[PDB]
Paper text:
RdRp of IAV is highly conserved among influenza viruses. It is composed of three subunits–the polymerase acidic protein (PA) with endonuclease activity, the polymerase basic protein 1 (PB1) with polymerase activity and the polymerase basic protein 2 (PB2) containing five-prime cap binding site (CBS). Host five-prime cap binds to the PB2 cap-binding site, then PA cleaves 10–13 nucleotides from the host five-prime cap and PB1 synthesizes viral RNA. One potent inhibitor of the cap-snatching process, pimodivir (VX-787, JNJ-63623872), is a cyclohexyl carboxylic acid analogue inhibitor of host five-prime cap binding to the PB2 subunit. We have crystallized proteins of PB2 wild-type (PB2-WT) and selected mutated forms PB2-H357N, PB2-F404Y and PB2-M431I in complex with pimodivir and obtained four high resolution structures.
Mutation F404Y did not severely disrupt the viral growth and retained near the wild-type polymerase activity. The selected mutations in the cap-binding domains decreased the binding affinity of pimodivir by factors of 280 (F404Y mutant), 7 (M431I mutant) and 130 (H357N mutant). For the F404Y single mutant, the enthalpy change for pimodivir binding was substantially affected and was 4.8 kcal.mol−1 less favorable than the WT value. This change was only partially compensated by a more favorable entropic contribution of 1.4 kcal.mol−1 (referenced to the wild-type value). Since the thermodynamic analysis showed the greatest loss of the enthalpy contribution in the mutant PB2-F404Y, the structure was compared with that of PB2-WT in detail to identify any visible changes that could explain more unfavorable enthalpy. The root-mean-square deviation for PB2-F404Y is 0.08 Å up to Cζ. A considerably less negative ∆Eint of the pimodivir: PB2-F404Y complex can be indicative of the less negative enthalpic term measured by isothermal titration calorimetry (ITC). The H357N and F404Y mutations caused a considerable loss of the stabilization “free” energy for water molecules 1 to 4. W2 and W3 became even repulsive upon the F404Y mutation.
Residue numbers in the entry: 321 to 482
The structure:
């Protein structure tokens, strides 16, 4: 069965995961209690303006292949995938006001809290994610933290289908 996150419809296409609650420490030193998915899984992500295929494991993005209508729509998909990955570099990229601990009995979803944080401005997320050298795969291109294309380098695990 499918579920929506960040305006993408997710469908699990392979694998499985078990759940473990973990109290992580954000970059601005707040505690979030997140349900960590442990396992090796593949998802499709279908949005109104971008599509992606995500392979991930426990708190790790392994591969994301993305297509979309413009740079902004591609970036939107990437930010959703980087939060959904639950990666420590994404948790440590949170900056600014302590606006996760301030909601009283609202009990907001920590994954949605993170997403709304990074949708505001993903520059620190992209700068801390990491880049790698890429193989030359015809029809695929790298995307750098400034969302410009590269034939040589890319955000770690991420490729754009031109
Ligand atoms: O935990 C949640 O409240 C929700 C919100 C935050 C992410 C998902 C979509 C919205 C999550 N829902 C679901 N996640 C997942 C799920 C599998 N592997 C994952 N890895 C990381 C992750 F993060 C969520 C998942 N499966 C079924 C779901 F139905
Ligand atoms: Cl929420």
């Amino acid at each position: 069965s499918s579920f929506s996150f960040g305006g993408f419809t997710f469908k699990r296409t392979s694998g499985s995961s078990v759940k473990k609650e973990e109290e992580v420490l954000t970059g601005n030193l707040q505690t979030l209690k997140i349900r960590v998915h442990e396992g090796y899984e593949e998802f499709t992500m279908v949005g109104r303006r971008a599509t992606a295929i995500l392979r991930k494991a426990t708190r790790r993005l392994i591969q994301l292949i993305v297509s979309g209508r413009d740079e902004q729509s591609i970036a939107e998909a990437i930010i959703v995938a980087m939060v959904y990955s639950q990666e420590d570099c994404m948790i440590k990229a949170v900056r600014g006001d302590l606006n996760f601990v301030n909601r009283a009995n609202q009990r907001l979803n920590p994954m949605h809290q993170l997403l709304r944080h990074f949708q505001k401005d993903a520059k620190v997320l992209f700068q801390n994610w990491g880049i790698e050298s890429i193989d030359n795969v015809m029809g695929m291109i790298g995307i750098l933290p400034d969302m410009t294309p590269s034939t040589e380098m890319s955000l770690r695990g991420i490729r754009v289908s031109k």
